[PDB]
Amino acid sequence: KCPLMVKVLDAVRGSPAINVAVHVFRKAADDTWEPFASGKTSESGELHGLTTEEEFVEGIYKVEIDTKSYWKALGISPFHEHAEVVFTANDSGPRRYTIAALLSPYSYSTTAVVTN
Amino acid sequence: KCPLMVKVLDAVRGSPAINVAVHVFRKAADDTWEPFASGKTSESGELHGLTTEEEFVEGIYKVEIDTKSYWKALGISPFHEHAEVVFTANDSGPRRYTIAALLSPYSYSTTAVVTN
Amino acid sequence: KCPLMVKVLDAVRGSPAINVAVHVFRKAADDTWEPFASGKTSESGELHGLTTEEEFVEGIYKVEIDTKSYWKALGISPFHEHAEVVFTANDSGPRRYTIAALLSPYSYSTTAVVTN
Amino acid sequence: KCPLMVKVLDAVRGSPAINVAVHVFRKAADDTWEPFASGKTSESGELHGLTTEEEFVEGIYKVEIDTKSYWKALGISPFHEHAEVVFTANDSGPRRYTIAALLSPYSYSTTAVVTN
Ligand SMILES: O=C(O)CCO/N=C/c1ccc(O)cc1
Numbered sequence: 001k002c003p004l005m006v007k008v009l010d011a012v013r014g015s016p017a018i019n020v021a022v023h024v025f026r027k028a029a030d031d032t033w034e035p036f037a038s039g040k041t042s043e044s045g046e047l048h049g050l051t052t053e054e055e056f057v058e059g060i061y062k063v064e065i066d067t068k069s070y071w072k073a074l075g076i077s078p079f080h081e082h083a084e085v086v087f088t089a090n091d092s093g094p095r096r097y098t099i100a101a102l103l104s105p106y107s108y109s110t111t112a113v114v115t116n
Numbered sequence: 117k118c119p120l121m122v123k124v125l126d127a128v129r130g131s132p133a134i135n136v137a138v139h140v141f142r143k144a145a146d147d148t149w150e151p152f153a154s155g156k157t158s159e160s161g162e163l164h165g166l167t168t169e170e171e172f173v174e175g176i177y178k179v180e181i182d183t184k185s186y187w188k189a190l191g192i193s194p195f196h197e198h199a200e201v202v203f204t205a206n207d208s209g210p211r212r213y214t215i216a217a218l219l220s221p222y223s224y225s226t227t228a229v230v231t232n
Numbered sequence: 233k234c235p236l237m238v239k240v241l242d243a244v245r246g247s248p249a250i251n252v253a254v255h256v257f258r259k260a261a262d263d264t265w266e267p268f269a270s271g272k273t274s275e276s277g278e279l280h281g282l283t284t285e286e287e288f289v290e291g292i293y294k295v296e297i298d299t300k301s302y303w304k305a306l307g308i309s310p311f312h313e314h315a316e317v318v319f320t321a322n323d324s325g326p327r328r329y330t331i332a333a334l335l336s337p338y339s340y341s342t343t344a345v346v347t348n
Numbered sequence: 349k350c351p352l353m354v355k356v357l358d359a360v361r362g363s364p365a366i367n368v369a370v371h372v373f374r375k376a377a378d379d380t381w382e383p384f385a386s387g388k389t390s391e392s393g394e395l396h397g398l399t400t401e402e403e404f405v406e407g408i409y410k411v412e413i414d415t416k417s418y419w420k421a422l423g424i425s426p427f428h429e430h431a432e433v434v435f436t437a438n439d440s441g442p443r444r445y446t447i448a449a450l451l452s453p454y455s456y457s458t459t460a461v462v463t464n
């Protein structure tokens with residue numbers, strides 16, 4: 001089952017953050033960021049199916065959550081351009097990665113839930 | 117389906133917070149706190165089945181999460197006695213309440229996800 | 233020289249949370265919450281001068297931050313009644329405590345900074 | 349008089365996060381990240397003196413907080429490589445920015461306090 005999931009919540013409305021664009025990148029050997037996967041959060045604030053076990057190999061990944069566009073669509077002026085979560089994915093440890101983000105106009109928190 | 121759910125995460129280990137005691141109270145007419153429901157978080161960090169739609173009427177509720185005992189069992193010295201979430205439950209609005217808590221030894225955050 | 237300080241920030245506006253009422257209680261020998269100190273946050277979101285080292289003895293304290301009133305004055309209907317921070321203080325000799333809170337309408341986080 | 353300040357707290361120890369490396373970048377006209385300023389947090393968890401009002405012109409800035417190195421020195425293997433805070437600055441005239449970060453091994457939150 002999916003090894004990388006993203007969950008986004010809205011701390012102003014107390015709801016999933018719906019239709020949030022999410023872009024994932026993998027760090028290339030020349031230290032640049034290579035597009036890897038993308039999607040939009042669902043009505044439950046979740047984004048599944050970004051990648052597969054076969055392709056999600058060890059390496060450094062960046063998950064960019066397009067928070068600015070989200071707040072603009074709600075008519076709220078935000079601080080950040082996006083929320084960026086940068087981490088190393090590794091094999092000897094819990095398999096499923098869930099990247100959770102809690103959004104406010106001038107603040108955000110992000111948490112990783114790593115389980116098998 | 118269940119109108120009050122609790123989800124607890126551990127920000128040190130990146131995992132659900134398992135076997136965390138949770139006590140819910142309702143505010144009585146004499147302004148005291150009346151025991152209402154309790155349980156222990158599951159292996160997924162979740163506590164379901166605390167109450168039913170029929171009994172969960174409008175009023176002020178307190179959800180106490182016994183964080184101190186959780187950290188002590190992990191051998192970590194914590195700051196808080198517990199995390200307390202106090203809110204009014206109301207009928208004209210999203211039906212399902214999810215009280216989420218993210219735990220660290222000297223900090224915690226709590227968020228409400230209200231949906232129907 | 234202030235042993236107990238409270239700092240509150242607004243995650244919607246990216247500013248200190250001004251004029252937030254704060255009530256402090258201490259658990260008495262008969263297990264009730266006795267009023268200990270109160271005040272309001274300043275223009276900087278800070279509340280100083282609640283107590284003195286002499287009066288701030290060992291005990292279990294509860295810091296109640298009146299978030300609901302804060303949001304109502306901004307025209308926002310928030311989820312929580314207040315943020316409650318409960319902790320044992322000075323059980324290993326005197327310490328200085330800063331209780332920080334970050335507020336959003338449906339979420340808040342609280343951290344403690346403890347120094348000798 | 350400092351227009352850009354960084355404050356970092358440790359949610360495990362309940363203390364300022366000391367000696368945390370911070371790198372600031374500004375997006376150049378060719379869309380690359382140009383080095384802008386860097387430093388390390390003090391005993392109070394604060395980093396001041398990164399720039400001057402004159403040099404801190406309008407632009408998109410990225411504040412990279414080197415959290416992984418911080419946790420490794422404490423013997424903790426954390427999830428994130430660093431915390432990245434990306435924002436447009438001074439697009440409506442000069443402002444003063446405080447970028448605050450609260451760190452846990454598998455979680456972090458960042459807030460901005462912006463004043464005129
Ligand atoms: O049960 C749910 O819907 C929430 C599951 O994911 N949320 C995680 C989370 C919640 C609150 C935080 O301050 C940080 C992370």
Ligand SMILES: O=C(O)CCO/N=C/c1ccc(O)cc1
Binds near residue numbers: 333364
């Ligand atoms: O006591 C101290 O050292 C200063 C307290 O300032 N707290 C700032 C803060 C606290 C929690 C956050 O999630 C973001 C910023």
